């Protein structure tokens, strides 16, 4: 039954926006609420603004402290990479760069690996520093990780505050925040719950065959279900007219919803509800079960 199929392939490039779910590796999820300007973001004493502001109230009741330790170790890693980037921008030597990279590699207490740079060439050390200028990658095994002493020794190597908390200034008022704020580098993921894929609204579309109620889904342009629990909420309010217009003219009242649409276009916000076609379907099915049910004209 198929003559020919044409398969078109789009390619959307999706930027982040308010509504997108972002997450870290410790169960620290959440939704982007606002995309702030960089003059409005908080900044340190060097004028570098932060990229993401996270709430510290999500830490104590959830007890994911690896979030904070990853933040501290990422701050130390980017400080080491910043020192290597400063040496590469000053174009200093190869000997001082080899010495500093070796001094950063030999910092652990009883770490297993021994990275020796004396066996390295000069172009190998230059390629390694060109890959290390954006931060030194650090392997922290599970249940075998770095400790606070190693993190603080790395932060003291990178000429950073050993407590992992710097002074931040307000980008708007210019004033200083009163207490020192934890600033560092955390690995954040963009999850596949995108508000472009979740946003969906419908006024009037297509309807089901039997029930004459609207369809369901963003794919087929459907309406949201007003379930039994939402009916109970409107019953508890007493919003009888709102509930009746959910039940009839926004739904399976075929001769009432067209009247409501033309009434809204005519500027008359008044409905004329009738019997639900799903109730007519139910009456026909109980009649087909061999049971005479009928409406009683008083």
């Amino acid at each position: 039954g198929v003559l020919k199929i044409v398969k078109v392939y789009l390619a959307v490039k999706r930027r982040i926006q308010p509504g997108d779910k972002m997450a870290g590796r410790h169960g620290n999820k959440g939704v982007i609420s606002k995309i702030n300007p960089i003059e409005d973001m908080p900044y340190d004493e060097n004028g570098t603004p932060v990229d993401i502001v996270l709430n510290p109230l999500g830490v104590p009741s959830r007890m994911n402290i690896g979030q904070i330790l990853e933040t501290h170790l990422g701050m130390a890693a980017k400080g080491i990479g910043d020192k290597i980037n400063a040496m590469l921008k000053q174009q200093q030597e190869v000997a001082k760069l080899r010495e500093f990279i070796q001094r950063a590699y030999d910092l652990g207490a009883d770490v297993r690996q021994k990275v020796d740079l004396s066996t390295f060439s000069d172009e190998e050390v230059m390629r390694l520093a060109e890959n290390l200028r954006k931060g030194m990658p650090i392997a922290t095994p599970v249940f075998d990780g770095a400790k606070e002493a190693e993190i603080k020794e790395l932060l003291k190597l990178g000429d950073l505050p050993t407590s992992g908390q710097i002074r931040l200034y307000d980008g708007r008022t210019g004033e200083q925040f009163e207490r020192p704020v934890t600033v560092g580098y955390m690995y954040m993921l963009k999850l596949n719950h995108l508000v472009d894929d979740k946003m969906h609204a419908r006024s009037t579309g297509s309807y089901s065959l039997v029930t004459q109620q609207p369809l369901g889904g963003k794919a087929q342009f459907g309406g949201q279900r007003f379930g039994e629990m939402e009916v109970w909420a409107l019953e508890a309010y007493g919003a009888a007219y709102t509930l009746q217009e959910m039940l009839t003219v926004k739904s399976d009242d075929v001769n009432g919803r067209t009247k409501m649409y033309k009434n809204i276009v005519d500027g008359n916000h008044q409905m004329e509800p009738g019997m639900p076609e799903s109730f007519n379907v139910l009456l026909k099915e109980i009649r087909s079960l061999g049971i005479n049910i009928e409406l009683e004209d008083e």
């Binding site: 039994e228 109970w232 019953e235 508890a236 007493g238």
Partner: protein
């Protein structure tokens, strides 16, 4: 969550047809309210145990003041402070299970509308309100 949802649905369907359809059923029945002192301490004081109810009769004691609240009074915070300063321990208030109304309850037997602060208007689905109020903190249980 599954068990509390099923319990909330059972409660809404057992209490769906209850609506305040009268202002005063005209009864003398009531429930003897008392501060629950189970265990070794007071669990709920009489003030919040009786706050918003409607008294089935007067309170009768020589006591410290011989306070005579009238019959069928909505107990506000003022009357709660009156009973506290006159040291009352047993108040008989009109409950819902002793209402004289057929097919619904009266407004005096219910008492204060807890969402609006005044007496309940006739025509409010108190059964759906009560079933949702009981079945909402099942997730906290």
């Amino acid at each position: 969550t599954a068990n509390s949802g099923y319990l909330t649905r059972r409660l809404v369907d057992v209490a769906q047809d209850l609506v305040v359809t009268e202002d005063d059923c005209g009864t003398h029945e009531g429930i003897m309210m008392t501060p629950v002192i189970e265990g070794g301490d007071v669990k709920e004081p009489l003030r919040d145990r009786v706050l918003g109810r409607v008294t089935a009769e007067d309170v009768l004691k020589p006591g410290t003041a011989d306070i005579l609240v009238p019959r069928n009074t909505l107990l506000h915070e003022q009357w709660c402070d009156l009973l506290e300063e006159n040291s009352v321990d047993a108040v008989k208030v009109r409950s819902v299970v002793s209402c004289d109304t057929d097919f619904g309850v009266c407004a005096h037997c219910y008492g204060r509308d807890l969402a609006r602060g005044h007496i309940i208007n006739k025509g409010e689905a108190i059964g759906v309100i009560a079933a949702q109020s009981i079945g909402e903190p099942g997730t906290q249980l």
